[PDB]
Every structure is written in C-alpha cells, then in structure tokens.
Design a protein around this ligand. Structure first.
Ligand code: HEM
Ligand code: HEM
Ligand SMILES: Cc1cc(N)nc(C[C@H]2CNC[C@H]2OCCNCc2ccccc2F)c1
Ligand SMILES: Cc1cc(N)nc(C[C@H]2CNC[C@H]2OCCNCc2ccccc2F)c1
Ligand SMILES: C[C@H](O)[C@H](O)[C@H]1CNc2nc(N)[nH]c(=O)c2N1
Ligand SMILES: C[C@H](O)[C@H](O)[C@H]1CNc2nc(N)[nH]c(=O)c2N1
Ligand SMILES: [Zn+2]
Lengths: 409, 411
C-alpha cells in the first residue's frame, strides 16, 4: 500500500502514498506490463462522484475542507447537476483544475513549472472566428517576444457531445507535409494527412519544406474553418551551428512555441475537448525527434555527410556524432535569438528536484519513465537512474480521437 | 485473448498470444505501473505442477507431447518428488531449460543468440575448489582468444536452502573498488563492499584502478573460499581512440568477458542458485554505464577536459560529446584487438528482427523497454519506437539476495 522508489545513483529512497488516490486504470495487470504502449457523455449518476472528488481536493487545497463554504458549494453543484445534467466551474476552480491537470501529467518532464500557468478562460466563445481570436491572443501572450510564458486557453466544455469544440491541429504551430510524384515527402511527414484535410477544405498550400499550417477550428460541433496565424505572431528560429559554418545551408528552422492542441482536459468530471496549452521546448524534442526520427525530417544522413564521417559501418557511431551536433545547433540557435529553451541536462535535473518537492509536499509524483528519460544520452541524465511510479490522477490531460474520424459533416 | 504492439516508426503491428502462458506476477496492477522499478524452500505440493508444466513444454518442443516417453517421464518425476521431495533434470532438459531462461529474459537485448549457448553441467560439483575449476574452464571456453562464445555453467540445485551453491561475485570478472580515508574511490565504486569482503577473507589487494577481483565461491552451504583466476585466462582490452592519441594516456582498459554470476536459474520448479553465464559486450555497457555513470568510473569530466570542450554550460552538450567519443574508443579498441563486441545500432536492429521472428513462430517475445533501449542515443535505435509487452515466462533467470546478507557463517 505504501510504495518505495529508489534513485540508483544517489541511493535516495522516497515513499509514495499519493498513488492510493489514483482514479483511472493504467493498462497494466499483475500478469502484463503495458508501460511502453503509447495509447493504452457522462450520465447524471457518474458526474456527481467526479464533482465531489474534485471539490473536496479543491477545498482541502485552500485549507477550507469541511467548512460551510465547502458544504455550500457541494450542494450548489449537486443541485445544478440534478437540474441541468451538468455544472459550471468557478473561475478559481477552473484555474486550480488546469494547474493540476499539468501537475498530474506523468509524461511531462517540465512540471517544476506547474504553478506558473496563465489560464485563459474562453468558455464564453461561440464561433470559430472567436476561437481564432483567443488562439492568436494565447500565441502572442505565450511567445512574449522570445521570453516564453506557459499558458492554456480553455474553450467551452462538452455538453451532449454533438456540439464539441475542437482544434483539429495536433499543435497550434506545425509544418505542412506533402507526398510528391517523386515518392518522397516534402516537409514534415507526420502532417501529410492533416495537410491534405486543409487542402480539401480550401487551403492554398505554398508546397514548401517549412510552411506553417493554418489553424482548422471547430466551434460548437460545426464544420471546421481555416485561418492563417499572423506570421509576425509565429516566432521561428533559423538553425546554425557555433562551429560549423556549413550548417545554415541545410536551410533548417523550427518554431519557438510548443503548443499541444489535440488533448482533452478533464476537471471534476467535466470535459474540455479544446484546451490548447503551451510552454517552451526542451532541445531534444526538436534536434532528436523532429529532425532525426526516420519518419520525421530524418536529417542524420545529410548532416553526417557534411561532417565527412565514415558512414560505412554503424560502429563508427556516425549517427551518434551527427546527433550531438544537430542538438548543439538547436540549442545555440534558440539561445542566440533569445528564445527560451531548456537542454535535457537542465530539465531532467529540475524534474528530479520537482519529484523531491512533490514527494515531500504531496506524498508522490506520477511519472512515466519511458517518456521522462530524454531520447538521447539517457543514462547521463539523473532521471535515468530514478525509479518512478506511474498512475493516473485527475484533473488530467487525456488523449482523444482525431476529429476527422468522429466528425459528421 | 490477443494483445497488439505497434512500431511507431514502421507502423508494423504484431499480435501477442504468448502472454497467456505467463504465470509469475509483474509488480504492476490496474492502478499502478511499476515498469521502471529495478527489483519489483519449495514444498511437494507446489513442485509437481511446476515440473509438469515444464515437461509438457519440453516434450512439445521436441514434438513428443503425449508420447509414451513423455508420460513415462511425468510418472518418473512424480514418483521422484513424492519419495525424495525434489527431482533431477535429464541433461537434455537442463540444456533446453537454460536456453529458455535466456530466451525468456525480457531485460536482454542479445536474445537473437538464445539457441547458441554452451551449457556446462556442473551438477556433480561438491567443493569450492571444484567450482573454481569449472569456472576457469568456462572462462577459457567462453573467451576463446577473443572470439567469444556464449556459455553457462550450472552448479547443483537448491535442496533445503541450507546447502546452497553460490558465486558471491556479481560477475565472474570485475575490478576492485577501494574507498579512501578522504572519501574518494580508487577503482570501481560499484565493487567497494564486495572488495571489502574479499580483503577480510584474506585477499591481498594490489590497490590499483583495475585489479581483477578474486572469485569468492560457496559450495554446499559452506563458508565461501577465495581463488584467483589465472591472469592468462583474463582477456583485457586497453582502451584507445582512432583519432585522439591522448586517449590511451587516460590509462583505461576493460575485460572482454561479461559474465553474470549472482542470478538464480529456475527450471521446472528447481532452483539453481549458482549458474554463471556469459556472452559478449554491447559497447554502451562499458562506454556509457561502466565508464560514465556518476557512481562508476565517472570519466566524462577528464575526457571533455582533454577534448577542450566548453564546460561552463550544460547546453554546449559537452557531456554528450565526450560520451560519443568514449563509446567510439571502446568499439575501436575491442575491434582492433579482435575481441567480440557489438555496437548498440547493430544489437537493437538484430533484436527487432529477433522479436518479429518470435512473434511469428512463438506468439510473442516478452521485453522490458526500460532495459532494452540503450543508455545513449535512444531514439535513433529502432527499439525506442517499438511497443513491447513485459511478462514473466519460466524457465527464467531471477534476482536473489546477496549471499553476505543471508549466509549462516560456520566459522
Ligand atoms: C514550460 C515548459 C515545459 C517543458 C520544458 C515541457 C516538457 C515536456 C516534454 C519534453 C514532453 C514530451 C513531449 C513528447 O515527447 O512528445 C512533455 C509532454 C507533456 N506535457 Fe509538458 N512541458 C512544458 C510545459 C507544459 C505545460 C504548460 C503543460 C500543460 C499546461 C504540459 C503538459 C504536458 C502533457 C499533458 C504532456 C504529454 C503529451 C502527450 O502525451 O503527447 N507541459 N512536456
Ligand atoms: C551473446 C551476447 C549478449 C549480449 C550482446 C547481451 C546483451 C545484454 C545487455 C546489454 C543487457 C543489459 C545489461 C545491463 O544493462 O546491466 C543484458 C541483460 C541480461 N542478459 Fe544478455 N546479452 C548477451 C548474452 C546473454 C546470455 C548468454 C545470457 C544467459 C544465458 C543472457 C541473459 C541476460 C539476463 C538474465 C539479463 C538481465 C540481467 C539483469 O537483470 O541484471 N544474455 N544482456
Ligand atoms: C506544452 C509542451 C511543451 C513542450 N516542451 N513540449 C510539448 C510536446 C510537443 C512539442 N514536441 C512534441 C509535442 O508533443 C505532442 C505530441 N506528443 C507525442 C505523441 C502522442 C501521441 C501520438 C503521437 C505522438 F507523437 C508540449
Ligand atoms: C551475459 C551478459 C552479456 C552482456 N553483454 N551483458 C551482460 C550484463 C553484465 C555486463 N554489463 C552489466 C552486467 O549486468 C549485470 C547486472 N545488471 C544490472 C543490475 C541488476 C540488478 C541490480 C542492480 C544492477 F546494476 C551479461
Ligand atoms: C513505443 C514507445 O513507447 C514510444 O516510442 C515512445 C517512447 N518514449 C517517448 N518519450 C517521449 N518523451 N516522447 C515520445 O514520443 C516517446 N515515444
Ligand atoms: C530506475 C531504472 O529502472 C534503472 O536506472 C534502470 C533503467 N534502465 C536500465 N537498462 C539497462 N539495460 N540496465 C540498467 O541497469 C538500467 N537501469
Ligand atoms: Zn506496468
């Protein structure tokens, strides 16, 4: 019932009690571990337990548990659900809920930052043009001229499930991908399907390698609509290397603002299906994953060639050498252009400190080791040596089906 | 039931049915995943089912399930258990068992090789001197002048748990570690406690940075005895770098033969508490873990110093740079001396081919992602992108308590 986690580098042992407050299921059983699997409406009856659980933790958090104001709010929400089949969160609850969904995100190494989140309440939004406005304002606020600030914008909650708000983009800012007669892929291969949806809905694709995609926004269950984000709001960084003068000629760039927009925020049983949120990048996300995944920009081969490495045999570690250089360049470029970025050493060191705070202050910290350990140089980061327990707490961010599969036109 | 795994790089989807044969528990529940936890006397009653399950598996593998020989062997083992409380494996069953424990080892990336395992049957062994002789022969056979061959030596099984055979070394070949009065460590800090035991038992320590430890061997529940492996049997590689000529002057070397000696082999309910096994290295085990863990040789700083990397900010990626150079050095050095080694790209690519094969022919391949993914350059290896299912099959290799924690000293 009480669980221990050990760090094998430092011998520090922490005791987890927070897992006993775990609501949702993991995918694992006593017979099988699904730890490495990527992906493993509410009737009146289901909603009240969920609301009570949430309000209890909320009132506890402001040191008012069992107070008249606590009991009063529980009755008010109970009455509202009994009458309307749903309920509305107070601003204070919504903010607490959003901060806690981030605090609970077991796959996020950046959670030391969880209490500094700007929450933009977009529950009064009714159209896609309204959504576009809210999103530009979020983009501009979060970007802050390179001095990035964490933010989330929360559109109206699901009702009967036929009037869903959705941002169809997987992130607010991404690059288009196009299949060519050639048989190869121009731009980002991850976005080929989405790019085609944009085209089939009207978008004039410039057909380049780094074309910022249009937002495709769905309000109130309606057909989604296209908008170009003002370019002056999309802060991009040209990638150069501090030692290699040829690096700029690869013609690489990335965007400054990582902003996930396809997830669902669950607070007190309510479901916010459009809740784009953003922070700032850890360097490896771009340099290792975006640039080097075989199925992404896949640039290792071109870079290795320019370095004049021996690509005859895997054992020369030519991939590993090129990988480090690409990642030095990402960090140097962002740092030179004064755009907030964190390297994997710094971010994992901060996460270990955050785990210790959470264990000391909350009795635990759900973490998914498979996600938390950076995709390069794993064991030279402290997280590699840290046992982590993974479990699901609410409020939470959850995955949801891509809208093009669900939506009826 | 069927469980699917997806490779996110290739979109190849595989279907597991083999998990239906898993008996042991994982540590996980519906409410918690213990996937990153390092470590998550049998009665007759519990023994016959375990024997039967094993012999059914063996007899199926040789295409003799339900034969007279299968039935006679069940009857014979049954009778042996009831009368003597245990039983003895036939040589053939021991071989099959040890190969399968390797095939089932979900933390092992090298399992493409599982069917090529030399099994040395050391069940007639009775003394520590006998164990020493068996282990020297294993070392010489496995080493094979650098052309490494996988092998395992299997000492007598547990009886009442008061008469255990144990190799106290965690690996047959490892370097001493010595804690100095000033709190620094000479040699391998992983081996400090074990080094202290060896010293106390009477080992004369040379006190250098790469002193091969003596074997500390326990037979039949007796107090363990020290033995020095003949140095001519301990193949070592001096580490140098193909471009950096100062690399040699770091004074680094490593041994060629990775040989785990502290695990317990379970076959058909029987427990082999001393079963040292060996293969060949994947470079990262030495270049990443042994050399660069903060709690091991910890050479990153000195290497990066000598490379004149910018060390004042982690964001220069100096550690990552020095890490790649060290790992190039390890593979170059082994290759130059003709000692078998595999790089992490080759080994993971082979593992994925092994895993796909296993899914087709066996219905699955239990794998622990946390261990299988290499400790550098994770996502440029194909295993990073491969979903894996982890479950426990027998025969198996298991952890067991360090023997200095449990041994009853006879004096
Ligand atoms: C402030 C700087 C932040 C850093 C450095 C950071 C770091 C990261 C990284 C490296 C990942 C893994 C992404 C991947 O590999 O696909 C991630 C995932 C995630 N983060 Fe953060 N994060 C930050 C801010 C935030 C914020 C502001 C939120 C929510 C308000 C958030 C919630 C999440 C969630 C829910 C995931 C899992 C996403 C998924 O499953 O695809 N993070 N974080
Ligand atoms: C032949 C070449 C082999 C290679 C390249 C290889 C590779 C590896 C590696 C890299 C590990 C992880 C070690 C660590 O990080 O501590 C490992 C673990 C393991 N291997 Fe292998 N292996 C080989 C042969 C063998 C053999 C012959 C056996 C037994 C017959 C074996 C059984 C195991 C077991 C039980 C583990 C888990 C060890 C633990 O939990 O500490 N492997 N293998
Ligand atoms: C808020 C935030 C900050 C930060 N530094 N990084 C992120 C993650 C963003 C930026 N880089 C990857 C992207 O994550 C979204 C996709 N998450 C991984 C994923 C999940 C399901 C399916 C596919 C897939 F790639 C989000
Ligand atoms: C047979 C074999 C081949 C091969 N290439 N590698 C190995 C593993 C050996 C050599 N390198 C590390 C060592 O692993 C032994 C123990 N594994 C780590 C471990 C397990 C439990 C607890 C702590 C701990 F560090 C074994
Ligand atoms: C199959 C495996 O779970 C998958 O490749 C994971 C591994 N770890 C990851 N870790 C992070 N941070 N992001 C990812 O996309 C992944 N992908
Ligand atoms: C806490 C964590 O499980 C631990 O550090 C693991 C991670 N993955 C590993 N993987 C391998 N191959 N060997 C190891 O020792 C470890 N250590
Ligand atoms: Zn699990």
């Amino acid at each position: 019932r009480f669980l221990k986690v050990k760090n094998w580098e430092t011998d520090v042992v922490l005791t987890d009690t927070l897992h006993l407050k775990s609501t949702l299921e993991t995918g694992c059983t006593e017979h099988i571990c699904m730890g490495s699997i990527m992906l493993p409406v509410r009737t009146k009856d289901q909603l009240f337990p969920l609301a009570k659980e949430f309000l209890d933790q909320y009132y506890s958090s402001i040191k008012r548990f069992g107070s008249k104001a606590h009991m009063d709010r529980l009755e008010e929400v109970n009455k509202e659900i009994e009458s309307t089949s749903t309920y509305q969160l107070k601003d204070t609850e919504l903010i607490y809920g959003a901060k806690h969904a981030w605090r609970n995100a077991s796959r996020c190494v950046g959670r030391i930052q969880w209490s500094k989140l700007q929450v933009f309440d977009a529950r009064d939004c009714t159209t896609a043009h309204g959504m576009f406005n809210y999103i530009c304002n979020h983009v501009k606020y979060a970007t802050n001229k390179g001095n990035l600030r964490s933010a989330i914008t929360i559109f109206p909650q699901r009702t009967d499930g036929k009037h869903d708000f959705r941002v169809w983009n997987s992130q607010l800012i991404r690059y288009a991908g196009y299949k060519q007669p050639d048989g190869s892929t121009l731009g980002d291969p991850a976005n080929v399907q989405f790019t085609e949806i944009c085209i089939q809905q009207g978008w004039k694709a410039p057909r380049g390698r780094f074309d910022v995609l249009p937002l495709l926004l769905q309000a109130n269950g309606n057909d989604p609509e296209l908008f170009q984000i003002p370019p002056e709001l999309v802060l991009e960084v040209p990638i150069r290397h501090p030692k290699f003068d040829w690096f700029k000629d690869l013609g690489l760039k990335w965007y400054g603002l990582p902003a996930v927009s396809n997830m669902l925020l669950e607070i007190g049983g309510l479901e916010f299906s459009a809740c784009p949120f953003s922070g700032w990048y850890m360097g490896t996300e771009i340099g290792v994953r975006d640039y080097c995944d075989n199925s992404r920009y896949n640039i290792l081969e071109e870079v290795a060639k320019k370095m004049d490495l021996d690509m005859r045999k895997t054992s020369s570690l030519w991939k590993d050498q090129a990988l480090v250089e690409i990642n030095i360049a990402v960090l140097y470029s962002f740092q030179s252009d004064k755009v907030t970025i964190v390297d994997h050493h710094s971010a994992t060191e901060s996460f270990i400190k955050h785990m210790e705070n959470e264990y000391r202050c909350r009795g635990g910290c759900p973490a998914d080791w498979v996600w938390i350990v950076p995709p390069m140089s794993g064991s030279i980061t402290p997280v590699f040596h840290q046992e982590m327990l993974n479990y699901r707490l609410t409020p939470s961010f959850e995955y949801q089906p891509d809208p093009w599969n669900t939506h009826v036109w």
